[PDB]
Design a protein around this ligand. Structure first.
Ligand SMILES: Cc1cnccc1NC(=O)c1cc(C2CC2)n(C)c1C
Lengths: 156, 39
């Protein structure tokens, strides 16, 4: 399969036509996505198979081929870029200032942008192009719009 | 069956579209990994 670093689409044929269920990050030979995209299933790349290595339904994260590699963090100050990859549309950089999700276990960056659910696992970047987490787990607000947690794993 | 297709390099882009607000929200995270508004 293709194992060059970069941002991928996650597709299924188990429905009408070819459907984009989500997005992920290829880094250092490991594929990184949200658990709600794949539900922990194996993935094809060319005639290559990618097998799940690590996952956690509560973090809503999953890695393929190896352990989670992405460890950069939101500074808590600077704007970020969502590298949004929407269904049938070209990858696009959207720059935004995160707000905060306040939780009993600590504060978390959040990004206040609407896109189709097949966008899930788009990477969020800092100014040096490091992935500080994945977009597409969060909360619906009064307006009916989505607000997403900046969702990061941990590198052991 | 699920497959991947490369969509781009991971790069900061000068003069990307600059949008979205910076909301401060009280939230709870359940064991199924679903966030909810603690209102
Ligand atoms: C499917 C799922 C399962 N489990 C947890 C979260 C989700 N995520 C969504 O339901 C979702 C994601 C987005 C966009 C930011 C990508 N939008 C608007 C919604 C409603």
């Amino acid at each position: 399969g293709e194992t060059t670093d970069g941002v991928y689409r996650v597709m299924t044929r188990r429905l009408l036509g070819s459907t984009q269920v989500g997005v992920g990050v290829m880094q250092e030979g490991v594929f990184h996505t949200m658990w709600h995209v794949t539900k922990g299933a194996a993935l094809r790349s060319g005639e290559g198979r990618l097998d799940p290595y690590w996952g956690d339904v509560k973090q809503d994260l999953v890695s393929y081929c190896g352990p989670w590699k992405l460890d950069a963090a939101w500074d808590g100050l600077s704007e970020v870029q969502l590298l949004a990859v929407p269904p049938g549309e070209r990858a696009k950089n959207i720059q935004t200032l995160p707000g905060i999700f306040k939780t009993k276990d600590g504060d978390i960056g959040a990004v206040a942008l609407d896109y189709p659910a097949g966008t899930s696992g788009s990477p969020i970047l800092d100014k040096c192009g490091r992935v500080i987490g994945l977009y597409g787990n969060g909360v619906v607000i009064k307006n009916g719009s989505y607000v997403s947690a900046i969702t990061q794993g941990k590198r052991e | 069956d699920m497959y991947i297709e490369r969509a781009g390099d991971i790069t900061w882009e000068k003069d990307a579209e600059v949008t979205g607000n910076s909301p401060r929200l009280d939230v709870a995270l359940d064991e199924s990994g679903d966030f909810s508004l603690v209102e």
